[PDB]
DNA sequence: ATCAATATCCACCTGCAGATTCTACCAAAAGTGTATTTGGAAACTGCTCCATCAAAAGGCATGTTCAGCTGAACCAGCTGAACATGCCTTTTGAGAGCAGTTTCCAAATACACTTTTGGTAGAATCTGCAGGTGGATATTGAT
DNA sequence: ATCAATATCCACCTGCAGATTCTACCAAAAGTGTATTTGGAAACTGCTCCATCAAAAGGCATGTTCAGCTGGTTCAGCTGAACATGCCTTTTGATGGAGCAGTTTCCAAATACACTTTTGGTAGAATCTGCAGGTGGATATTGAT
């Protein structure tokens, strides 16, 4: 070949969309998440221990929350006639759903 | 080296999450914001969980504590008992 | 019942949670009842917003 | 030999699944999901029935309270079919004591 | 002055804003709202009567809900670099709040 | 005569009232199309609420809808209301 | 002459208001609002405390459970101040019977 | 306490609902606790977004 | 910019519609005493959890590269705000239904004891499915 | 249109972790009988809902005027998806041994329940004043010029 084969922008991203939409495995790595949780809980109470299933539960809850947010965010972005998401989109969605924080 | 440990949640994992949301294009500034956002959610959950844990005068955190703390934020969870 | 229909549709004989999520979200009424529930290992529905897809003007144009 | 006892709704789910689709199995995780689901609906309905009874200063829960709660919580046609099933169940039970 | 006095576009609305935000009186007239309530109740059960306070309570709830909706609407509008609200904004707001239609 | 006041129905909820409500929401400039959609939205909300109220009414075997039923119906939809009893 | 008796929390609120801002009154409607507010908070706390009791197989609801519920519902410094008031109050109660 | 302060701002000696709404919405924590509550006859805050206000460069222009 | 128009802010006065305060009582708070529970001290076990190692392997960090996207300028046109007005819709005031109590009871339903008894823990087998193996398509982009 | 490159679906097919079957028990469901508690069908009382017709006050359906917003176009940057490459944080997979989840004993600390005795919280009848409303006038604000 004279040049390397190289997909155009969007195609491979869309391929990844369909792949991850077809499967269900968790996307966050186990160990870093474990260490994060342990550090925060340590900040609240010391020398705690964690069942594996509680960590898994937090994992599932976080990923579900994130995907829900990004979905509504994407709608907000499309509303402004763009395709690239930006922080103010997230802030808008989070302000409307009442998770103001 | 560790970077306050939130950085274990790498960029491409967040990118995969966004992909599952049906998003095509992501700006480079999202990632940092997302981290902060995530932290808040987790903090709230764990506080509630630990509080339940503290009431039983236990030192081991159980899944059920998390399930209840999620239930109270209106994000009820199925599939981990009770 | 709905899950088993989806199972036969995917040529699998044993039920797993993905089938349940597919069954729930595809019915309007159950979606209203379970709009704020997360099924573990459930994933999401296939859905791409129409406007983000590339144009169908991809063929001989010369 | 000291050992525990954990209750669940596994067997009943299994019966129903064999009744509607005899030649098909289901994994344990999905059974867990169904268990959580059943418990959640049980909690919701009982809570609503309680609130109704308290607002009218009646100390008893009857099928009527459950029925009202169902029509409030569940939407439309699903509520109708469920009400019909429950009504048939009560009428057969009271007939065949 | 030969010319009748005339305010520039975008001032009497502001005057309305300050007047209605300083006060708390209900904006909608009672009768058509009352007739609407009775008409809608007829399609579920017949020969119902309504206490006045119940209708007043409903009116308050409706106005608060719509007021909140217009706030969220205007934010959704401002995100699109407009000042004029339109239906697609409303549809977006209701999609994000998690309601049905 | 066909008067049927603007429909003998919701269309008596005139434009300037909606305008006033939009003014309370901080809005400055409104399109003509908002009005109809708003009415539809309002209708939907009312329907659900009234249904629940009437259901409570049906449980106590009454033909007069009380304030308390409405308050509870508003509570179940996450729109708790203060100032009309309980 | 059937003469009813509808209870409320009005008078206590009025006392507190005269304690904190002596030269000020308050209409009836606002008092009704505050009454509904108190009722709401009471219901939330009691429900939460009940669930806490059931999860740990305890049949007594105690001050500890109330404390836990308050730490859950309320944010930060408000929780701390409320807890401090409660602890002071229970400490005074336990001694000076 | 908060309501009484708002009352003194309007030179009224008697607390009315408007004052309560102002008290709740201007304190962050109570607003979180009562985020999904409507105060009857309460109204809202005068908050108008800066963008929809006229141009502050409306000055000496010849 | 300066001056006219004109709404808004703000002083001063009166009375009456809601606020506040007095009074005779009955549902409710509280003190005894007992019985009846119940949750924390004490004492133990055994499953599951926290700190280590070793051989890969698959994912992250970093560094190039270019197609395709996000504002900024500008503007034809449309479309929705500001006023005259008249005109017409909305406010106000002159007996029986039904919510709210009360009797009081035929019916409903908790609770003590036994007798079963299907449900569950746990050992002992099935087999559909996570992998693999390989071939045939189906998108995609270059040209 | 055509044809090479990569990614994706589909026939054969095998050993096993998870699924199902099977024993053997005993902690939950029913029966019998009883003691206790209720929701709902008759009387009765006092608010307050049904929604007409004159007379009058003030809001809207219509039409009219024009400035300033929408939303289309063109385009100069710019920035973020694809990708190769290395290498290095994690994956499986074992092994230990400390200690918390959880269990059992049992009785000292905390509460229902049943009675009696104060008492203050709540209707209802007499008094108050802050604010609605009115009156009037100085200053702030829009805008022509």
Q: Is the CB of residue H48 less than 8 Å from the CB of residue H36?
A: no
CB F41 within 8 A of CB E70: no
Helix, strand, coil shares, percent, chain C, to 5: 40, 5, 50
Helix (H) or strand (E) holding D45: helix D28-55
Q: Cα Rg for chain B, rounded, in angstroms?
A: 16
Instruction: Flag whether A touches C (3+ CB pairs, 8 A cutoff).
Output: yes
Q: Which nucleotides of J are covered by protein (CB under 7 A)?
A: 1-2, 4-8, 18-20, 27-28, 37-40, 45-46, 48-50, 59-61, 67-71, 79-84, 89-91, 100-104, 110-111, 121-124, 130-131, 142-145
Q: Which nucleotide is nearest to D4 (CA to C1')?
A: I121
What is the dotted CATH code of the domain comprising B1-82?
1.10.20.10
Helix (H, G, I), strand (E, B) or coil at F75: helix
Q: Are F63 and E47 in contact (CB under 8 A)?
A: yes
Q: Domain total for chain A? A: 1
| Residue A65 CB-density burial (10 A; 0-12 exposed, 13-18 middle, 19+ buried) | buried
Spatial neighbors of D57 by CB under 8 A, at least 6 apart, are none
Fold of F1-86: Histone, subunit A (1.10.20)
Strand I footprint nucleotides (protein C-beta < 7 Å): 1, 4-8, 18-20, 27-28, 38-39, 48-50, 59-61, 67-71, 79-84, 89-91, 97-102, 108-109, 119-122, 128-129, 140-143
Domain that holds residue E40: 1-101
Determine, for residues F59 and D68 on separate chains, whether the beta-carbon distance falls below 8 Å. yes
C38 forms beta bridges with B77
CA of G10 to C1' of J122 (A): 11
Solved how?
A: cryo-EM
Non-local (6+) Cβ contacts of A72 within 8 A are A93, A97, E95, E96
Q: Where do the structural domains in chain B lie, given as residue ranges?
A: 1-82
DSSP-derived secondary structure letter, C36: T
Contacts of B78 (CB under 8 A, 6+ apart): C37, C38, C39, C40, D33, D36, D37, D40
| Interchain contact B/H (3 or more Cβ pairs less than 8 Å) | no
**C-alpha span between F47 and C57 (Å, rounded):** 46
Q: Which of B24, B23, B27 shows the shortest CA–CA distance to B11? A: B27
DSSP string, chain A: --S---PPTTHHHHHHHHHHHH-----S-HHHHHHHHHHHHHHHSTT-EE-HHHHHHHHHHHHHHHHHHHHHHHHHHHHTT-SEE-HHHHHHHHHHTT---
CATH number at E78 reads 1.10.20.10
d(CA D77, CA D75): 7
Q: Positive or negative, the Cα torsion across B25, B30, B32, B38?
A: negative
From the candidate CATH numbers 1.10.20.10, 2.60.40.10, 3.40.50.970, 2.40.40.20, the one assigned to the domain spanning D1-97: 1.10.20.10
């Amino acid at each position: 070949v004279k040049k390397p084969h190289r997909y155009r922008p969007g195609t491979v991203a869309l391929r990844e969309i369909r792949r991850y939409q077809k499967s269900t495995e968790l996307l966050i790595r186990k160990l870093p998440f474990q260490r994060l949780v342990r550090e925060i809980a340590q900040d609240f109470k010391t020398d705690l221990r964690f069942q594996s299933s509680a960590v898994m539960a937090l994992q599932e809850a976080c990923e579900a929350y994130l995907v829900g947010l990004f979905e509504d965010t994407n709608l907000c972005a499309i509303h402004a006639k763009r395709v690239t998401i930006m922080p103010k989109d997230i802030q808008l969605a989070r302000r409307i759903r009442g998770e103001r924080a | 080296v560790l970077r306050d440990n939130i950085q274990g949640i790498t960029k491409p994992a967040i990118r995969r999450l966004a992909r599952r949301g049906g998003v095509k294009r992501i700006s480079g500034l999202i990632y940092e914001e997302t981290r902060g956002v995530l932290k808040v959610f987790l903090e709230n959950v764990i506080r509630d969980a630990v509080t339940y844990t503290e009431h039983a005068k236990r030192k081991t955190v159980t899944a059920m504590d998390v399930v209840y703390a999620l239930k109270r934020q209106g994000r009820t969870l199925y599939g981990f008992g009770g | 019942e709905l899950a088993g229909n989806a199972a036969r549709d995917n040529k699998k004989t044993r039920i797993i949670p993905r089938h349940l999520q597919l069954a729930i979200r595809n019915d309007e009424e159950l979606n209203k009842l379970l709009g704020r529930v997360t099924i573990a290992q459930g994933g999401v529905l296939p859905n791409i917003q129409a406007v983000l897809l590339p144009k169908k003007t991809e063929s001989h144009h010369k | 030999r000291k050992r525990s006892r954990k209750e669940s709704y596994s067997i009943y789910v299994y019966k129903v699944l064999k009744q509607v689709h005899p030649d098909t199995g289901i994994s344990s995780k999905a059974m867990g999901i169904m268990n959580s689901f059943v418990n959640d609906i049980f909690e919701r309905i009982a809570g609503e029935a309680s609130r109704l009874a308290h607002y009218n200063k009646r100390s008893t829960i009857t099928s009527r309270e459950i029925q009202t709660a169902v029509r409030l919580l569940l939407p439309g046609e699903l509520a109708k079919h469920a009400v019909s099933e429950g009504t048939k169940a009560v009428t057969k039970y009271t007939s065949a004591k």
